[PDB]
Write a protein that binds this DNA or RNA. Structure first.
Ligand SMILES: Nc1ncnc2c1ncn2[C@@H]1O[C@H](COP(=O)(O)OP(=O)(O)O)[C@@H](O)[C@H]1O
Ligand SMILES: Nc1ncnc2c1ncn2[C@@H]1O[C@H](COP(=O)(O)OP(=O)(O)O)[C@@H](O)[C@H]1O
Lengths: 596, 191, 596
DNA sequence: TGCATGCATGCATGCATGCATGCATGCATGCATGCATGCATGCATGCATGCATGCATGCATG
DNA sequence: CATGCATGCATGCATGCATGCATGCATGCATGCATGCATGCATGCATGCATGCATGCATGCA
């Protein structure tokens, strides 16, 4: 029987749980969906866990005492509130855990300065996920069959990790020969099991000082929380700092620590991981539906992406289209056909070449800036594991591996050696990377979009000598890149005037609306080619072979594959489902300025 | 381990109301038991006799004139052992202490308790001098003296005794209340 | 959670508990009465335990398996049936124990031959109650108050006696200084307690062999079963033979035994204890009410009590009246006035003197046959205790003490020495016994009825010499006895004829109906004297003083006190409430034949 | 000569006196066990020597 | 007098060796704790002594 203390934490929180009805409809939708989830699985043929997000908002405006008690000694208020919450689950119609979401300036400190203070409290820690261990299940409930009596039995096992209170440990040996001497034949399947995982978290390098030895702690996960993180991200972790173990006083330092009762939140980096958690309201999409009913919004989106840069109209138009990415149609039992678009630009220095690059990085999603050399692990993983648990070989995902469904920013492309350029033919064309070293030959997938930037060989001689061999690049790399933009050094006065007041007003519709409009178009706007799309480009591509060869070079059928992608990405902008001839009229003009 | 139980028995307001009944009683010149306590302070008597009837008379009196009294007859009737000293420390709050100059032939017990009364206060007078002499309203200045000095306990110097007294059925005949304490019961009837 | 075994014993017995509705109305009457018992105690001013008798009948005609399992291993079927019974108590509106009444020829053996066989079974044992120990309460639940926190707590303690299953013992020290350092001030009253008792049972002396050393075992009682037996009775005990304790295998014989889970049934002896458990139906009392409406039933009851004895009509009439016992009216703050009647008879031998005595014993209730000497403890207790628990003096109730509200049968009264005759004046007149030895002076109560039998001094000379001093008894003993019957040795032929065919038909309305009619009249038939009762006996008693003294002697006012008793007991026979003159007309004739 | 009365004598019912018996308890002796030390083992990690790449030079070219 | 080719030299990185550094297995050594026994204290049972009482016998009386 519980005491008076235990029920009072219940009834006070039950008073709060009756205070706000927003969480009532939450658990209602949990139960109805999982009922309907089992309803469709068991009627025609003849997943979700139990936790609800509670903010750290309302407890301050309800009970400042119950506010305070959690933030110091959480080991008294967490069990009865859950017991009261499992009461609500049983009354309105299994752990039924919680979140404790909420921002607080109390204990959001660095893990670097965490030790020996604020022990047995609840601390919010962020940092780097590294050296993720293996996923193991845990034994809980054993099932045994006795032969002659013909009945089953019952036996449980517990550990100190889950319970959060120091209870008297009672170990029990795994049973054999129980009562009279019948053999306890073991069974499985009905014996229950729950997965288990432990990981280490390094602190933030951007928060770190200049150079010192980093120090870290460990986090053990729970059943529905196993394996949400790959090693190498930025994740906020909210849990309770608990120290277990007999600290060396049995028979030189004990009291090793850990953090349990946890919730895991991956957060966006500058250049790592997902940023697609941005919501869309009905108020949001109604603005998009009001926006997409126009006739000239491609121009407005073109002029939008030069917030501080004069000119370069047709360059910006393609930068919309690469983030559209084209359509992907993998053939039936054949191969995929590549859909993304890769562009290199060239021009004289101090002409907004480096004023373009981070704008491509920050506006887009899942981008990696690759600068200078890319030696030994950018396109590769290098398989260097000396794992102390067992002699084996695993991988550490390189940047080209990591930038899948994304953008790779290549800076100073001409300074790259020929070594990694072998891999670029493999990456840009077959969309796969196969690594075959003596441990394990492998094969993986990476379909990144690529923008690189190279200089001329000597001087600013961009137009003087000849258009051929201003770069002196290998021949297939011409065929790898789709459009090759040449930026001139035109000296004028009217053009200088447009430079003049632009920079002067600089030092004295929007971007966050834009990426909502971008990521919405990915999952519902892919179009399909129509009959009108053939008749123009058949006439047009013959002109591309018959007369462009009298001016420049080369013309491959791979160029016609890009002609499909340009009309494809243009239909994504208008969010049409068919493909119009006007999309080709846009796409035909894009080759003329890029080349002639 | 070792849980807790709440029960309707209180110790707080019962101690408050028992102070008032120990002060406010006029019926049977001035207050009854303070004149008795002054007779105890006269140092000529060793017993304190408490009935249950004036309690019940007071408990009749408070409901008829005021809103509500906590029940105190059946409160004492249940446990009855904690009511010895928790009642008796409220007695030492109010006392006409110097009411007679001490006799030279009074009691050899009396001269010892007069010391421990005085040795308490002279030790109390020392510590309040040092603290005001080393500064950096005086209730906290009084409060610092309270916890920094070992003293004689007030349980150690009492000199008197207290015996309870059961209620007759006679007033219980007028108003029936918890009159279960006074029946001619047998040792065989002692379950 | 219980297993499948535990609920199956429940549901099978719940099937039996739903089978027979006789026990349903039993527990119903238990709950309604105790509700009404608390209702009258708590409405104007402003006991019964929980066990129900179940026979050993119906289990054989319902489940022979569940029959068998109880009779061998009771430690598996007793707990779930009670749990199912407490379910019935809670469903229709605390242990709620049972009885297990029932006769079985399986294990009704002597305790003399009980040891080392049938251990851990249920055995029914009868025998002698001796050396009853002291009644002690047992501590169960401790209550503690902490000063500064101002809350109570909770703590229990258990022992191996109650649970009937060998559970892992977990001793707990009595608590002090629990959590932080607040003093655990003890409390009482709300701390619960249950009484406790242990006794020893010697076997039956009538079942015992001629002479050997008796051997015995022990029985520990329970809460509602403390102190039902005085030491010195014959009691059936039904319980379970359990052996506890570590039998010497820790570090010369252990395994001491006892019997728990018990029900206690005192049974009638030949000359000890109560026989008033005889029921009365409505069919029974209707026969009595049909019987009492007559006019001559005193004659029929007079002739009934000589089943094999010829004659002695007026002698038998008084033997009805002694068992009536007269009325008792203790005065207001004075003394009691004695109501019973004591008779001595005398006559020549072989004249049905010894043919009367056991008929007085067996028909009556709570009689003690006292023969020959009565030295040192018949009228006394002698206070001989050398009790090993503490130096003290207690009593062993003697026969005159033990025969309270009963009959004392004195055989061969003349052979008694003058020593105990001192006590007879104390017993017969003041109805009390005071024993004052150097340990403790005492005073007790005994209001026995007395029949004695003495012989003549020499020969059969009952009429020859003189009516005075045929006995040569002390003078007050004439005044002690009420009627003095003289049986002659009349030699005839017509009288011999009535002797002749009587004994001949002997060797070739009822008694059990009679004692029902007797014990019914005790609690509701006492009468009260009327005006007509004065006028006859005032005229009559003057004749008793004026003319009987011219014939015999003595006449005291004590004789008039017997004249009240005779009219009193006669009204008990007719079950009238007033007193009629005819009762005195009977009572007046009774003195004439007794004396003249 | 027969009978009632007083006197001498054995009996076993309570007080001193002797001894056997049962129960509580502090201490000296034996045994299970933690602890220091070094080992065979298993596996991660630094390092230096020779080859392909970058740049200077002599020769040829026009 | 102004470029292109063959020739020779300087130099940074891949890795299969030697060696230091974490878990189990084993063995010798010294500290501490449960416990049966010698001892002492408390208690109940049995015999000799004082004796009131019942009984047999000596005694005088009608
Ligand atoms: N058309 C333009 N409008 C505004 N600023 C410009 C323009 N062209 C160049 N800039 C200036 O040039 C700088 C960027 O130089 P950039 O050409 O990106 O570097 P690099 O040529 O070395 O890659 C920016 O600071 C920007 O102010
Ligand atoms: N009137 C009678 N009728 C029948 N039997 C009688 C009668 N009188 C005597 N007896 C016989 O007398 C015997 C009892 O003798 P009893 O006089 O009682 O013994 P005692 O005189 O020694 O006390 C019985 O067996 C019984 O048969």
């Amino acid at each position: 029987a519980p005491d008076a203390v235990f029920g009072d934490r219940v009834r006070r929180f039950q008073e709060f749980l009756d205070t706000f009805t927003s969480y009532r409809d939450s658990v209602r939708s949990i139960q109805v969906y999982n009922s309907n989830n089992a309803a469709n699985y068991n009627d025609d043929q003849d997943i979700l866990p139990h936790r609800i997000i509670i903010s750290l908002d309302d407890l301050r405006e309800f009970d400042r005492s119950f506010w305070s008690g959690i933030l110091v000694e959480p080991a008294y208020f967490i069990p009865p509130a859950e017991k009261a919450l499992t009461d609500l689950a049983d009354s309105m119609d299994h752990p039924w855990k919680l979140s404790f979401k909420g921002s607080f300036g109390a204990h959001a400190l660095s893990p670097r300065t965490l030790t020996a203070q604020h022990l047995n409290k609840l601390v919010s820690v962020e940092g780097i996920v590294t050296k993720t261990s293996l996923v193991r299940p845990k034994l809980i409930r054993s099932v045994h069959y006795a032969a002659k009596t013909g009945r089953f039995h019952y036996r449980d096992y517990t550990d100190a990790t889950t319970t959060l209170t120091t209870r008297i440990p009672t170990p029990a040996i795994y049973p054999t020969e129980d009562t009279e001497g019948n053999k306890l034949t073991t069974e499985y399947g009905y014996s229950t099991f729950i997965d288990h995982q432990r990981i280490t978290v390094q602190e933030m390098p951007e928060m770190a000082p200049a150079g010192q030895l980093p120090r870290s702690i460990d986090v053990i996960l729970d059943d529905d929380l196993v394996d949400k993180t790959k090693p190498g991200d930025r994740v906020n972790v909210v849990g309770v700092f608990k120290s277990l173990g007999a600290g060396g006083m049995n028979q030189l330092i004990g009291f090793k620590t850990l953090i349990l009762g946890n919730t895991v939140y991956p957060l966006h980096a500058r250049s790592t991981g997902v940023a697609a958690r941005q919501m869309l309201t009905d108020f949001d999409i109604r603005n998009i539906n009001k926006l997409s009913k126009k006739k000239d919004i491609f121009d407005i989106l073109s002029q939008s992406l030069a917030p501080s840069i004069y000119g370069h109209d047709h360059i910006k138009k393609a930068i919309l289209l690469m983030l559209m990415g084209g359509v992907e149609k993998n053939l039936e039992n054949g191969s995929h056909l590549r859909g993304d678009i890769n562009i290199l630009m060239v021009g004289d220095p101090s002409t907004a070449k480096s004023q373009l690059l981070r704008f491509v990085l920050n506006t887009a999603s899942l981008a990696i800036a690759t600068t200078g050399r890319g030696s030994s692990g950018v396109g590769l993983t290098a398989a260097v594991t000396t794992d102390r648990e067992t002699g084996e070989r695993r991988l550490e995902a390189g940047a080209m591996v990591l930038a899948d469904r994304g953008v790779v920013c290549i800076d100073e492309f001409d300074k790259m050696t020929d070594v990694d350029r072998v891999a670029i033919h493999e990456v840009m064309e077959q969309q796969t990377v196969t690594i075959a070293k003596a441990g394990i030959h492998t094969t993986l997938n990476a379909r990144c979009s690529v923008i690189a930037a190279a200089n001329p060989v000597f001087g600013q001689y961009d137009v003087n000598r000849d258009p051929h061999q201003n770069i002196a690049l290998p021949d297939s790399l011409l065929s790898r890149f789709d459009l090759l933009f040449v930026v001139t050094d035109d000296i004028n006065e009217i053009r200088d005037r447009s430079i003049s007041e632009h920079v002067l007003r600089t030092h004295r519709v929007t971007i966050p609306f834009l990426r909502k409009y971008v990521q919405y178009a990915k999952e519902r706007v892919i179009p399909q080619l129509t009959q009108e799309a053939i008749n123009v480009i058949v006439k047009n591509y013959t002109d591309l072979r018959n007369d462009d060869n009298t001016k420049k070079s080369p013309i491959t059928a791979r160029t016609l594959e890009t002609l499909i992608r340009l009309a494809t990405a243009h239909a994504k902008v208008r969010l049409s489902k068919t493909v119009n001839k006007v999309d080709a009229k846009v796409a035909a003009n894009l080759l003329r300025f890029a080349l002639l | 381990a070792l849980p807790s139980i709440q029960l309707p028995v209180d110790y707080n307001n019962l101690f408050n109301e028992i102070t008032d009944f120990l002060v406010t009683f006029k019926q049977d010149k001035g207050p009854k038991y303070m004149a008795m306590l002054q007779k105890v302070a006269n140092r000529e008597l060793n017993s304190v006799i408490i009935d249950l009837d004036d309690i019940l008379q007071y408990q009749n009196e408070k409901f008829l004139q005021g809103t509500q009294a906590d029940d105190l007859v059946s409160a004492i009737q249940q446990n009855a052992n904690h009511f010895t000293e928790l009642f008796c420390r409220a007695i030492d709050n109010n006392m006409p202490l110097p009411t007679k100059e001490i006799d030279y032939k009074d009691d050899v017990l009396d001269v010892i308790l007069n010391q421990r009364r005085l040795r308490n206060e002279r030790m109390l007078s020392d510590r309040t001098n040092e603290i005001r002499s080393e500064n950096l309203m005086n209730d906290a200045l009084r409060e610092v003296v309270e916890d920094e000095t070992e003293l004689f306990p007030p349980n150690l110097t009492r000199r008197y005794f207290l015996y309870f007294k059961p209620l007759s059925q006679n007033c219980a005949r007028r108003y029936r209340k918890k009159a279960i304490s006074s029946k001619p019961l047998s040792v065989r009837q002692i379950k």
